[PDB]
Amino acid sequence: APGASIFRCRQCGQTISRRDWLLPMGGDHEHVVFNPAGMIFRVWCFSLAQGLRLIGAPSGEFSWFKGYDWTIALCGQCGSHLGWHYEGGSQPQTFFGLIKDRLAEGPAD
Numbered sequence: 001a002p003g004a005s006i007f008r009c010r011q012c013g014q015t016i017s018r019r020d021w022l023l024p025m026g027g028d029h030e031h032v033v034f035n036p037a038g039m040i041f042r043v044w045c046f047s048l049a050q051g052l053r054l055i056g057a058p059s060g061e062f063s064w065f066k067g068y069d070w071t072i073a074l075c076g077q078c079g080s081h082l083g084w085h086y087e088g089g090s091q092p093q094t095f096f097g098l099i100k101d102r103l104a105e106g107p108a109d
């Protein structure tokens with residue numbers, strides 16, 4: 001009965017990802033970053049995620065991950081901004097960077 005298994009949206013409980021899907025980008029699954037508006041994010045990288053809605057077309061502007069374009073990822077249920085989907089890069093071509101404090105971690109369904 002593991003308690004550290006599944007990540008859900010902190011606001012509504014939508015299933016989003018899994019600890020098993022953590023991805024060590026540049027040797028670390030955690031990346032502490034800031035946006036042009038100065039907001040600091042503790043971003044956890046995941047190979048896969050579900051339950052999101054990706055908004056708009058990709059952009060390379062200000063990307064925290066060299067060679068990747070990003071799209072905003074909202075919770076598909078409640079619209080909470082959960083992070084970004086990254087695409088267009090290499091090894092891997094795509095991944096998710098999700099905001100750790102916006103997810104709740106718990107046991108598997």
Ligand SMILES: Nc1ccc2c(c1)C(=O)N([C@H]1CC(=O)NC1=O)C2=O
Pocket residue numbers: 034035036037061062063064065070084
């Ligand atoms: N007009 C904007 C408003 C908010 C944000 C961005 C542009 C942007 O690019 N980012 C992140 C996404 C990224 O990969 N690097 C960042 O600084 C944001 O949070």
Ligand SMILES: [Zn+2]
Pocket residue numbers: 009010011012013014075076077078079080
């Ligand atoms: Zn939600």
